[PDB]
Every structure is written in C-alpha cells, then in structure tokens.
Amino acid sequence: AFANPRAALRYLYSCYGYLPQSNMVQSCMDFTGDETISPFAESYVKFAEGSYDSSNTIISYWNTLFQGIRQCYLLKENIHSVPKISQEEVDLYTAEADFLIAYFHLLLIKCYGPTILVKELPALDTPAENMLGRRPYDECIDWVADLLDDAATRLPATRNSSDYGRATSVIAKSLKARMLLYAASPLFNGNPDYTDFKNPDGEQLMSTTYSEEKYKRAADATWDAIQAASGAGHELYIASTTSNAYPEPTNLTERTLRMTFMDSENYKEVIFPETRKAGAYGIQRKSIPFFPRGSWNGIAPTITMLDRFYTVNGLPIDEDPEFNTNNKLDIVTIPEGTTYAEPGKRTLYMNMNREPRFYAWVAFENGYYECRTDDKRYAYHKFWGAERSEGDKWLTGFLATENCGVRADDGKIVTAARSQNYSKTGYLNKKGVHPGIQATVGTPGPTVEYPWPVIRLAELYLNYAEACVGYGKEGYPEKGMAYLDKVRERAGLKPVLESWANAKVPLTSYDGQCGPDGRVMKIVRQERMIELYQENHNFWDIRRWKMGETYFNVKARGLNILAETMEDFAKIVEIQDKRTFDAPRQYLMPIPAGEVSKNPNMVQNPGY
C-alpha cells in the first residue's frame, strides 16, 4: 500500500480518483442545468427535475469528497515512511495531496456553502461522526485560499506528458480565483436570504452585508492566475490554417471555436484537464446523427439556450435592430453562398445570421454536422442524400421524416416516432464532439478522445471581467473588459463598446454602468453563458447569480419535432420533462439527513 514508491504513486492517483469525473456524463452532477435536454436519464437529470432533499441526495459530495480528503491525509501521514522514496517524491506527492485537500473543500463550498474544515486525518467515516461542525462561509473560503496558495509554492507550473491531469501552481491559482469570484456573487455576498442561517449556537454562517471588496479580491486573484497561466505558455486557441487529418469544419472561425479544447496539436488554452476517459456514453456519441447503437442523436440544445447566442453583430437577439425576434419562426430560403447551411433549402429565420459560436456548436435544420460514419446507414444512408465533404460533414434534417428526426430509421421512414435516441428540441449539440467521430452500429469508445477542460484560459478572462465589473471602481472595469473583448475577438466578434454602439439601447461607456446590477454585468454574464456553453458551468453560475427561479423552475422548450412539414415544425412546444427549482432552498445541496442527527452542532442547509 505504501510498500514502495510505485505503490505510493498509485495511491496518489487513487486520491485524484475521488474527484468527480466531470466528463462522465452518466455520473456527473452538473452536466447542464438548462442548456440541453436529452432522453438518456442520467443522474444529472434528477437535479434538473428538482428531486433532491436530505433523504434523497442523488450524488452526495458530502460523502465521496470527505473520503477523498481522508486518503490525502493518509498519504501525507505515511509518505516519508515509504522505502526508497526520495525527498523530491515526498515533497511533490505531499504538495499534490495538499492541493487535493484544498480542491475537495472547494468543491464542498461550491455545493454546500458552509462546510466542515478537515484539518487533520479523520478517523471516522463521515464528517458528523468525527463531530466536525460547519464553519462560516467566509472562514472556509479563506482557509482553502490559504491552502491553495501554499500548495502553489510547492508545485510545478506545468506537467510532463505522463503526469498530465495532475496539479500545477497555475491550476491552484486558477481555482482560488474562481472560488473567490463565486464568494463575491449574489448568492454568497451579503445575500438577504441567509440573514438567519446560523449554527445551533447562534454563530452566523453567511455574510450579512454586501462587500464590494470581495469582487476586488477576486479580480486581483484572477489577475494572478492570468499572469501565471500566460507565464506558463497558455493562450487562447486559434485554429491552424494548415491541412490536417480532420478537414471539417472548414470555416476558420467555426473551426477555432469547435476545436478550442479538442485539438491535440494545440491544447495551450487548457489549464486543468480531466484526463479520465469519458467513454462511449459521453458527450460525443450522445450528440451525433442517428445510427444505433453507437450514434444516438440525443443531446439537444433548448430554445432558452439557443436564444442566448448572439447575432452576427455580437449582440443579443433582442438588442440587435437588424434581427427581428418576431420573425424567429419564419421559414426562409437559404441563399446562394451561405456557408453554414445548404443553399436552396429552407430553415427557420432564427437559425440564420447568428454568431460563429452558434454554427460551431449547434446543429439545426439544414445546417451541417461535421462527423463521420463507418457505414452509410440510418442518418448517413444514401437514401437521405445528406453526405457532404466526402463523408466528413452531413446535412441535418429534423422534421420527423428527415434523417435526424423521430420517424427516421435505416434509409427509410417508419410509422412510429421513436422514444429513444432522438432530439427533443429539433437541434443537436456539436460542442465537444470531435469531427473525427465515427458513427457505428457497435458501442465502442469515441474514435478520438480528448481531455475535458475543467479550466481553460477563456474562463479566466471572463472571471476577470466579471470581478472587475462587479467591483466597478479604481479603473478595474476597463482592465477586465479588455480581456472579455479578447474572448469576443477570438469568437469572430467586435469589442463590446463597438458592438453595443448599434444596439437598440446603445452603450457607449462603462462609466456608471458597472457593479453587479448594471448593464455591463448583464453583458459579462451573457458572454459567459455563451462561451462556456455545456462545460459544466451553467448549473453553478445560474445558482450563484440567484437566477434559479428564472431558469431552473421552467420547463425546457423545443420545436415541434413531430412535424412532417416545415410549416408545422416552426412552432415552439413545451417539453413536459419535470424541471423544478425551489428558491432559495435549492441554491445549495442538502446535507445528508443522518449527519444532522449525529452531531448536534451540525446544521442543515436552509429549507431542507
């Protein structure tokens, strides 16, 4: 177990193994909140349904992460003792074990708010059984930030290939920054919902007064993280213009956005990779055009999510005078020369003239899906005539009688609409789907695997912008907004002030429009909702912004997927899958009921 240095290393990897595997779609808690909907009945869906309380926790970080923390303290206890172990190995594995303790607690704070602080190896199985009590939120934040800072001084700035996925100082700084931004957010920073949220002895657990200083702290920490990341070689991904084995997508901006974290020739944007394999049941085979049993045509962007993408002018659809929201469902003819949809076919108005990120990441009526097949069956069948680019991209039709629609089968239409492996909305996801994926009748792993981006540099840029705008003073907004404009520029857009010059209500300066409730913050938040689409942020961002009732207590919407004509397709229907959110209770997850029973000083989260 600690019998030799190799055994010790396998043990450090077991500690890492207790981290939630965020790219394991069937088992993660936070795949999405409201961005996509699917017919696969994964565990995360139970959170979307609102079906969690102290007796039905679904996924209990409280249990699993505490066990991970214990293992880290064991490694720390026993590492000096391993035969033949070097001081180099002792220092590094200890640093990584300390990092993990911090990160496990960061995850607890994210999920539960106030947490126990495990400061030493715990002897009993659960926090309450060790008679640990929850500490004020700000105390927990400050403790974890200190441990991350200290671990950072003892970690390398990058990992070698064999160690990829393991901790670095850049990761530690980036996690600290993110956590501090969360602490400054409406849910945690002077939130009136929590005035009486106290331990049984009366100790107040949540800050009661809003502090602008919390945003400044987050902004300074995000600046530290950005400087560390750029010092270590990280940059925003831009696609190569040279030929490679994967020619689609061909539009260079769409390709840049599609391949941000999936192009192994340039992973420099990725700061924290999740290198455990997502496997067959991950995002790729669940998103691609129908061909069972390896191609499931299921992860479908919702209307709410589609409405978040910008127009081609980098503006919200309800702020761009050149986009008529009254006409979203109008049927239009795709003109000659259109590169993201088939000339001469028809589609809905709201699918045209959107920003590159829309075409990079959304499949829609008579747009294209860059993917492959090992057999021209089902959606890839010659019958449909959807093959393009010598088999590297495919025309997607979502009417019931078209290749990606509910009555389609192997080169033929069938009477019944299927109830499995279909798009509930009339759209499909393309983000995180490598264009080299091969549809197939089997159920192997995806053709090309890649690490999932737990942290990537564009998130740091948006975190900085958010914190700078939230603070709103001392010249911070201008500094942070410049980094948000770099994200926009990479996505083919103009800077904010250039784009909002022509908005329905123009914005010509940040002055007097900052702070967490102003126009500039609204711009930041929507940019984040787009840029980080389907990367496990929505679930937590909607919560920290206190927008849980607005978005998570509303059923998803889609187009009329039973339609056999474009005219009947162009109608928005409510999807009846349960979607509920009880505010403020469900902003935080429930402490397991038994924990509050075992330790009198343990308090449940409000409302549970």
UniProtKB/TrEMBL annotation:
Record flagged with keyword Flavoprotein: no
GO cellular component: cell outer membrane
One family name in Pfam for this protein: SusD_RagB
Ranges of residues in domain SusD-like N-terminal: 27-181
Principal subcellular localisation of the protein: membrane
UniProt domain RagB/SusD: residue ranges: 268-608
Intracellular or extracellular location(s): Cell outer membrane
InterPro entries for the chain: SusD-like_N, SusD_RagB_dom, TPR-like_helical_dom_sf
Keywords: Cell outer membrane, Membrane, Signal
Gene3D superfamilies in alphabetical order: 1.25.40.390
Family that this chain belongs to: Belongs to the SusD family.
Protein name: SusD homolog
Species whose genome carries this gene: Bacteroides thetaiotaomicron (strain ATCC 29148 / DSM 2079 / JCM 5827 / CCUG 10774 / NCTC 10582 / VPI-5482 / E50)
